[PDB]
Amino acid sequence: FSNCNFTSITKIYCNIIFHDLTGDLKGAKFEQIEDCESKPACLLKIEYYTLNPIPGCPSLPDKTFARRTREALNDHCPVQNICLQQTSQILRLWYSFMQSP
Amino acid sequence: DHSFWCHSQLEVDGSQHLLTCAFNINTANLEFQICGALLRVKCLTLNKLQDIYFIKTSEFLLIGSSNICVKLGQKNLTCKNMAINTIVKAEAPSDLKVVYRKEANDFLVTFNAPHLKKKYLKKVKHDVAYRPARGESNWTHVSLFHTRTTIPQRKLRPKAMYEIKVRSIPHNDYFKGFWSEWSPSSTFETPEP
Amino acid sequence: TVVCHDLETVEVTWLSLEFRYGTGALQPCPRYFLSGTSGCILPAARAGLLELALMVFKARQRASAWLKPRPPWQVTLLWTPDGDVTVSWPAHSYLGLDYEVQHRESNDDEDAWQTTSGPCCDLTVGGLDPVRCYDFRVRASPRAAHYGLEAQPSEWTAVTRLS
Numbered sequence: 028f029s030n031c032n033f034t035s036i037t038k039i040y041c042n043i044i045f046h047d048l049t050g051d052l053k054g055a056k057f058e059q060i061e062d063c064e065s066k067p068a069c070l071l072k073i074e075y076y077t078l079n080p081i082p083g084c085p086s087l088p089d090k091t092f093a094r095r096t097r098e099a100l101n102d103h104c105p106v107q108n109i110c111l112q113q114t115s116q117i118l119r120l121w122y123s124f125m126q127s128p
Numbered sequence: 129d130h131s132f133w134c135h136s137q138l139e140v141d142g143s144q145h146l147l148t149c150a151f152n153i154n155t156a157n158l159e160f161q162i163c164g165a166l167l168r169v170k171c172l173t174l175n176k177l178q179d180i181y182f183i184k185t186s187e188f189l190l191i192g193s194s195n196i197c198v199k200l201g202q203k204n205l206t207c208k209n210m211a212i213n214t215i216v217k218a219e220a221p222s223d224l225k226v227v228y229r230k231e232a233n234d235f236l237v238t239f240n241a242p243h244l245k246k247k248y249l250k251k252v253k254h255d256v257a258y259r260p261a262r263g264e265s266n267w268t269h270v271s272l273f274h275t276r277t278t279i280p281q282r283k284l285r286p287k288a289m290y291e292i293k294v295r296s297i298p299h300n301d302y303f304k305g306f307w308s309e310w311s312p313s314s315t316f317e318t319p320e321p
Numbered sequence: 322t323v324v325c326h327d328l329e330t331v332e333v334t335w336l337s338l339e340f341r342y343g344t345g346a347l348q349p350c351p352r353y354f355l356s357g358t359s360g361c362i363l364p365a366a367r368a369g370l371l372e373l374a375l376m377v378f379k380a381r382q383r384a385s386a387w388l389k390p391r392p393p394w395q396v397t398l399l400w401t402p403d404g405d406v407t408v409s410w411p412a413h414s415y416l417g418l419d420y421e422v423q424h425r426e427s428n429d430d431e432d433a434w435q436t437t438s439g440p441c442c443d444l445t446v447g448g449l450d451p452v453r454c455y456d457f458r459v460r461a462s463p464r465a466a467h468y469g470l471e472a473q474p475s476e477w478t479a480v481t482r483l484s
Binding site for chain 3 (some may be wrong): 232234251256270271272273274276277278280
């Protein structure tokens with residue numbers, strides 16, 4: 028992901044996906060598991076959490092924020108409680124993405 | 129020339145978005161189809177209402193470009209590529225109001241900015257225009273990013289009726305587009321000096 | 322309460338507190354706040370997750386999760402020929418901040434503040450009368466998408482008067 032256009036992805040996230048994520052979480056929050064220290068490394072984790080289904084929330088990769096995430100990477104890179112939990116994890120990796128060089 | 133225009137509007141009557149297109153004649157058996165940059169479907173066909181075509185949907189990705197085609201059965205007469213996120217038409221402001229403040233010797237102009245309560249495009253630049261209601265005059269324009277401003281009494285002729293209106297345009301590093309329709313015009317009167 | 326001051330230090334206010342970055346060994350507060358304990362101040366790291374243990378209280382976030390920036394250092398006001406006012410200030414030493422610029426007529430109330438927002442390090446306020454006096458103040462506000470919803474804006478700068 029080191030060759031990705033991070034500026035474009037940031038604009039899509041800031042203006043769309045971020046709002047989609049916070050909208051779905053509706054104030055619900057948890058604790059993260061893993062972090063990242065670079066944009067390429069963060070994008071890798073973000074992509075993995077977002078587009079790979081997990082037990083208890085198979086529909087995650089089909090959520091709007093997820094489809095939009097998929098399209099942004101494509102374009103710029105060469106139980107309800109479980110859904111919410113994962114969404115919180117993904118969101119916090121974005122924060123790390125934003126704060127990383 | 130079968131040229132046409134389109135504009136989008138975000139979060140119109142909920143979370144849904146509105147796409148509107150129209151020809152620059154007769155809509156004889158002509159249809160508008162948009163393909164690409166949609167969430168769950170390959171294409172959508174717009175709904176015709178009098179002289180314009182529209183679709184209200186949650187399907188827009190707001191990422192990447194779409195092909196908008198005028199079609200007859202299956203023949204493309206004309207297709208243009210454009211991104212929904214770059215043809216966003218702002219919503220007009222509302223509740224335009226003018227109050228004369230004698231102590232300040234000015235007019236306080238207020239209005240409501242609907243985007244402030246919305247999710248994607250919250251920030252717009254406003255354009256307030258005013259001039260005397262009677263006779264010919266160049267409108268005076270004021271550019272703002274906030275929703276109150278003042279007009280000094282001395283800036284205006286006394287004992288006259290003014291017309292005033294306001295519009296908005298997107299101001300976002302991702303979302304781009306067009307000036308809103310003008311708000312309804314209000315009028316106010318200036319007192320004697 | 323937990324506040325990360327300007328991404329330099331983390332200040333915890335409420336007992337004994339332990340902390341660590343990453344998955345290393347918990348460490349004691351390097352400089353407790355003591356009565357005459359009321360809190361603790363520890364160093365902020367730009368990366369890695371800060372774990373706090375007061376177990377009576379637990380937390381685990383980047384220090385930036387609680388970001389409260391210092392106020393902008395010095396505000397300048399420049400009347401343009403357009404009839405607009407350009408408000409400018411020095412940049413912070415880190416990204417991800419919006420700046421809120423407030424103005425009001427100098428005679429007006431504390432409830433008459435008008436707000437505009439934008440990125441570093443200046444913005445324009447239009448439609449102001451050139452013969453009137455205005456008060457301006459600024460604060461830095463961490464972007465929700467950048468730092469999250471647990472971050473908070475700086476205090477307002479001292480008022481700067483324009484004539």
